[PDB]
């Protein structure tokens, strides 16, 4: 359940905060793959410390 | 340059704390996924050092938000900051009784 939630936050971060066009944004299902293993901690960092 | 090496370089630029220990070859698999590749490429291009807000400034800003003080919008900040001469005008040390 945790991966799905992070995948949504990343999507929101990419679209709302960094300005990625919604059309180019990968499906939530596809973003979940980025939170596999050590990549998860990395993207958590990105969502928190990296802003527009 | 393997997609993975680019990603790890970007992370180093973004001051990720464990970035020096990460080997690029370990992430080459992320770029093999034809569907995610465009996003990762985007990310590695879009994210620079100017985008990074240290944990200290974020905490300070949250504290400012919590302090009930109105957060000035970009337009307002531009107006007020214009009025700011870069020059170190030493904080008017309010004429410390000492100055008087």
CB-CB: which of A26, A33, A50 is closest to B14? A50
Q: Is B53 left (phi over 0), alpha (psi -120 to 50) or beta?
A: beta
**Inter-chain residue contact A14 with B36, CB threshold 8 Å:** no
Residue-wise burial string across A17-36, b where 16 or more C-beta atoms lie within 10 A, e elsewhere: ebebeeeebbeeeebbbbbe
Nearest to B51 among A38, A48, A52 (CB): A52
Q: Round to whole Å and give the CA distance between B80 and B72.
A: 9
What resolution, expressed in A, was reported for this entry?
A: 33.0
For residues A47 and A15, what is the distance between their CA atoms, to the nearest angstrom?
Answer: 12
Structure tokens at A39: 């990549």
Give the CB-side neighbour count of residue A6, counting CA atoms within 13 A: 20
Yes or no, beta carbons of B46 and A39 under 8 Å apart: no
Q: Do A26 and B39 touch (CB under 8 A)?
A: yes
């Amino acid at each position: 359940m945790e991966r799905r939630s992070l995948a949504q936050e990343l999507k929101k971060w990419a679209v709302e905060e960094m300005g990625l066009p919604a059309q180019k944004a990968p499906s939530e299902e596809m973003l979940q793959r980025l939170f596999i293993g050590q990549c998860g901690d990395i993207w958590k960092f990105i969502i928190r410390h990296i802003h527009s | 340059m393997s997609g993975g090496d680019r990603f790890v370089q970007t992370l180093q630029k973004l001051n990720y704390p464990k970035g020096a220990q990460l080997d690029g070859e370990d992430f080459d698999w992320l770029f093999e996924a034809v569907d995610l590749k465009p996003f990762l490429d985007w990310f590695c291009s879009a994210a620079s050092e100017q985008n990074v807000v240290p944990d200290e400034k974020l905490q300070a800003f949250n504290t400012l938000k919590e302090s009930g003080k109105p957060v000035l919008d970009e337009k307002a900040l531009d107006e007020v900051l214009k009025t700011f001469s870069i020059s170190k005008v030493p904080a008017i040390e309010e004429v410390a009784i000492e100055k008087l």
